[PDB]
Design a protein around this nucleic acid. Structure first.
Lengths: 185, 134, 149
RNA sequence: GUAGUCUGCCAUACGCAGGAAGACCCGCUGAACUGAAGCAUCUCAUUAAGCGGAGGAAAAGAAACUAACUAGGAUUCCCUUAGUAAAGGCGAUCGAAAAGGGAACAGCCCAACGUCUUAAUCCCGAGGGAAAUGUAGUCGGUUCACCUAUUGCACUGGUCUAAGUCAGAUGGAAUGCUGCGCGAUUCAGAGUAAAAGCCUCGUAUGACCAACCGCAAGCUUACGAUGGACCGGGGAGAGUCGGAUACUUUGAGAGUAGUGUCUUAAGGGGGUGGUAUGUCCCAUCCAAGGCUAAAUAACGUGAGAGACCGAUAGAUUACAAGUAGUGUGAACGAAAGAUGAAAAGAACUCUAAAACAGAGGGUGAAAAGUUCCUGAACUUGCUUAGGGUUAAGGCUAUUUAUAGUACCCGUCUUGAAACACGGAUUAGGGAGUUUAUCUGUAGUGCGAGUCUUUGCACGUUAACUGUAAAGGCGUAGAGAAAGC
RNA sequence: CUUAAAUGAAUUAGCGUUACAAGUGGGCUCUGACCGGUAAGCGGUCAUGGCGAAAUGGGAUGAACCAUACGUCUGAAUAAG
RNA sequence: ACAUCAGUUCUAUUGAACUGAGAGUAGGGGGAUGUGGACAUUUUUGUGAAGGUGCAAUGUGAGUUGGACUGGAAGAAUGUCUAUUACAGAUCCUAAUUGAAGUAGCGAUUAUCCAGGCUUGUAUCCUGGGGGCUGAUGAGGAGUAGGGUUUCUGGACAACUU
RNA sequence: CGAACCAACUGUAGUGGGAACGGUCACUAGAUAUCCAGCGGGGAAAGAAGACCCUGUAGAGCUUCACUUUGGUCUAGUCUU
RNA sequence: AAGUCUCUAAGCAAUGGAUGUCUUGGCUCCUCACACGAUGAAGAACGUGGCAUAAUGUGUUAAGUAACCGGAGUUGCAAAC
């Protein structure tokens, strides 16, 4: 320890120098991944490679209520509303999730319309024939969230309110409730 | 520039493969051009050399003699020839090795495999010059 | 790199810029933070005072997505930065009437609002989770609304 | 007495187990050096060695899970959260998880219980055997919707490829030097008596004709399969969860996990919600049985690339090296590359006892003449030239043997020529480097922003280039904390 | 705000402020002052200087004393002696 | 008189004129030399590259360059990049080699002598004859353990058997 | 025929100062060289990083009225019962 | 006041193997694979070629034999085809 530097905090007391992991694989790893998903999409043909189709889903905690992401799979309720067979819909190229049942009415209306757009232009191969592999990233990918303004009319019941006196005198009402029960007993 | 990854362009690897090739590749590596009398006849420039035929070297001590091939050598990588002899200090002729790529082939002797090789390369050379368009 | 080092010029010099009498050696003090209450205390006392000791209340299972820890803040002087600049120029030319634009703080990741500087006299509506006393006061005085969520 | 069963032991028919390897993987067992400037808790470390066991991957895995929301939804891994919450002689140090972004994405079924099915099941190949101490199968019924065939594993060799051995001089040899031609979807590279786009193999690039063209599993049009709703039902893992106590273990703190001992539930009920305990609400799952690809790991073994080494280097090993050689043994372990383009590897004669050793004479461009390219220094021999009673050497000055001067370097030290230590000679090796987390100065780009990397898309492919969204640090702080 | 009057010792000199970091933390000593000791080239302090890290000349010889502190040369006149 | 490092007066484009100073261990800063490899740019070489040995210049210096002999195939420069990058010492490592030095020394075991044979060459290898030694726990004849061809015949002397 | 120890470079003395016991420094005395065999005065000769003494927040053997424990023995409770 | 001795330099050698130039060997990174064994593995021993000790092939069918795929001498001497 010397000079004006900050306390010496290096987590290097274990024998780290035996347990080293160098990442010179990374660009060769990229090709092992990449050559796999091309050897997929030929074997999967004529079915669409960007699938299977997945629901839009709100993220849980307070600081991601805004955002919406891809889930795991559609509910058996949401399929039957859209017009599908829950068990068979796995093999039509739609992921299914039996567990999720906290999704409220607003996000169901998206995911029903999401499946209807799929079921509108899904078609089935007959017996002998072969059909061209129609890729479409527009359908499978989630629609991006944005709102511009939503400007609205002024109420003229604003100066009636003051929020800070409503906040504080709820607490000061609550404080006197405890101090009366403590004092009286 | 090469596109094929599996062939190597390091000098260490190529020399090691060259000197320790299999027997069939070494016979192809030991080869020479024909004289222009035989080029118009058979329709090929380049052929691998056997113990039948004879050969003619420009530039040397043994300058401009014909002579038949007594022995090919694939480990030593050179060709013994009739006529191409210096005597020792003892009265004894010893045949002197020469690398075929210095040498032109003046006469050739047929084999089923040699005729079967020539008819392939004639048909190959007709296709390639039509493609390039000379 | 290895050319530009001071070590490279100290060839010939026998100690390599480390003394004769002392002799540069691996453990002068002891390892890391050692002797902080004893023989290296002067360093701790002088540069990092308050290092030793325990203070505060233990917090078990702290999460920072809770709305107890997690409050991002924004200030009253701006807000108008969140909206593009074509909007508020139209909002400046308006009667005491209609079309008062909603500056949504909560979409952009700002929960509380805090009055450090000025505004103009444009009407607007702040949607946020919380305010201060003075931030609520300044938004009224500009001529605008304080919505809660 | 004989005729079934039960239990035990022996003999025999048919396939199976063991041993090798062990980098990675799974289960146990388990140190100390070290750090804390001492040392005993702690740390090194739930590491090394030891014991046991798998596969090309293993292990994990389908909620008695997170959460408190505008809700997520098996497992694994990468980025971040985070050097944070926490742990700690609160010392040294140690140290996670949910959410968020990305790679990949697949779900299934025994038990019992349907208070039904005349074992409806399985092995052996006409009939024997296992099995009722339980194998096999969809809970029953009405009624609309709807689906119809593909899916895993397995896949082979060969042929052909452009343009000057151009001319002249030098040379043992031309690929170099001077001058004129020609090829290129081929100027990657090597071989060739010397430096090669055109002497040879190749390289490049499409064309060419043989070999195959099958293994299981499922199909195949309806009371056949699957699903929704409504009616009427059964059940869901016991020395187990849990408890007290002891030990090991963890960030887990009035116990994170495991194990011993004793103790031991309930099933209109039980677990979880990170401070013990009872108690009232709300939310969320249903333990004590099993299987399961992919993303992921790789100091072992087998088979292209390089700003790396160039024979004291690089592996212990460029070579008849795990060899020569040492030790009773476990084990230990070197030195050693280069003739020349081609052996043309030195005939024959003379002196001599002579496969002693030369001398003539020859081979080759040149002896380069056999651990033979180049052949340095130390040491030595011969020849030539000077100095010498001053140990020798150095420096300065000139008419060159004199004058004056000059202690032996390196090192610890207040002080070394020291009777302080290291130093016989010479060559070659031979010591402040790199990583992580930071500090400050200077340079550079953008600037209330900035970083494009985890990864995806490109590629003349580890590069470079393009880009979506998170995330990091910054933009607001004080307080133990509530609240501000 | 402003009413008056000036830059009112010598000699010398630009002054102020910040950042990062090395070595060091065994000293010895002349001349005076001093404590302990019979005294010591002994032990422990003080003030300026010196050596350590300072050559050259002088004290025959010497870290410390005297003159003086140094680029390479050519002269002149000196210091200690 | 000259060199270096500061500064003062000026100067665009790197300079001019002039003034001043001079120790240095531990240690710090500035500019420069050299080595292995890289990317550009430019060349040299069988009319002789690198290397090595002597000599003459040149730079304050680390160095650099010329010509002569030797050698027989590759080297170097300029600007940036990079590092297993500069040695007299470490009782340093490995490899070779001095003086001491033709010196110390050639021990222990009975004792050798003379004439012949074989040879280029014997006191030594063999024969013959003197003189001796061992003196039945014998350098006699034979075996365990151990060694492993040392046994036997023929040929051989580069080395070993002071 | 034919080694090794050892070796900074060396190899005559006296006093002087000097790390206080010089082969080299200053001032003097000596000297022509090169060998042999003896010899033990000197080279503070050689052989060993002093086994004495002291240091180290370095070890090890052994002891006990040091500090911690682990095992053995005894005793209680629970299980086998 | 002697030197074939000793000291220094140059030239030609002896000894020695540095320097320089060469490179069918390493080292590392990435890729693909792991399908050893009672049908006797890994490891050990000894055989066997015309001249073969080690290593490499190979097991009294012993530097190989049979079949299919390559297709003309893969090295010194000798011999055969």
């Amino acid at each position: 320890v010397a000079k004006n530097n900050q306390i010496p905090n290096d987590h290097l007391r274990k024998y780290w120098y035996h347990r080293v992991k160098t990442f010179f694989d990374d660009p060769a790893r990229a090709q092992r991944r990449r050559n796999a998903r091309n050897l997929r999409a030929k074997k999967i043909a004529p079915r669409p490679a960007e699938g299977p189709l997945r629901p839009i889903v709100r993220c849980p905690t307070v600081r991601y209520n805004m955002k919406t992401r891809l889930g795991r799979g559609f509910t058996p309720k949401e399929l039957v509303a859209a017009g599908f067979d829950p068990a068979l819909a796995r093999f039509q190229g739609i992921a299914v999730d039996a567990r999720r049942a906290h999704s409220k009415d607003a996000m169901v209306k998206q995911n029903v319309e999401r499946l209807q757009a799929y079921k509108a232009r899904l078609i089935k191969v007959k017996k002998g024939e072969t059909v061209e592999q129609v890729n479409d990233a527009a359908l499978f990918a989630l629609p991006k969230a944005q709102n511009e303004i939503k400007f609205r009319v002024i109420k003229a019941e604003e100066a009636k309110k003051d929020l800070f006196k409503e906040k504080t005198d709820k607490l000061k009402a609550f404080r006197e409730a405890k101090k009366e029960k403590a004092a009286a007993k | 520039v090469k596109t094929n990854p599996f062939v190597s362009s390091q000098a260490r690897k190529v020399r090691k493969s060259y000197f320790n090739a299999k027997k069939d590749a070494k016979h192809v590596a030991m080869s020479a051009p024909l004289s222009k009398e035989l080029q118009e006849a058979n329709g090929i420039k380049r052929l691998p050399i056997r113990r039948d035929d004879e050969v003619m070297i420009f530039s040397g001590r043994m300058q401009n003699r014909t002579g038949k091939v007594t022995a090919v050598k694939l480990s030593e990588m050179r060709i013994y020839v009739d006529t191409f002899t210096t005597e020792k200090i003892n009265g004894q002729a010893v045949s002197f090795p020469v690398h075929p790529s210095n040498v032109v082939i003046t006469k050739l002797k047929m084999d089923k495999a040699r005729k079967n090789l020539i008819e392939l390369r004639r048909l190959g050379r007709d296709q390639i010059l039509a493609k390039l368009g000379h | 790199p290895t050319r530009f080092h001071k070590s490279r010029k100290l060839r010939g010099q026998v100690s390599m810029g480390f003394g004769r009498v002392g002799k540069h050696r691996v453990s002068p003090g002891g390892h890391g933070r050692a002797g902080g209450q004893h023989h290296q205390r002067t360093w701790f006392d002088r540069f990092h005072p308050g290092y030793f000791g325990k203070v505060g209340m233990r917090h078990l299972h702290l999460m920072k997505n809770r709305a107890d820890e997690y409050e991002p803040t924004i200030n009253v002087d701006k807000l108008w930065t969140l909206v593009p600049e074509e909007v508020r120029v139209k909002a400046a030319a308006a009667k005491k009437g209609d079309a008062v634009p909603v500056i949504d703080c909560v979409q952009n990741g700002f929960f509380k609002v805090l009055a450090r500087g000025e505004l103009p006299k444009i009407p607007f509506v702040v949607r946020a989770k919380d305010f201060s006393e003075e931030a609520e006061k300044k938004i009224k005085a500009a001529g605008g609304v304080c919505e809660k969520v």
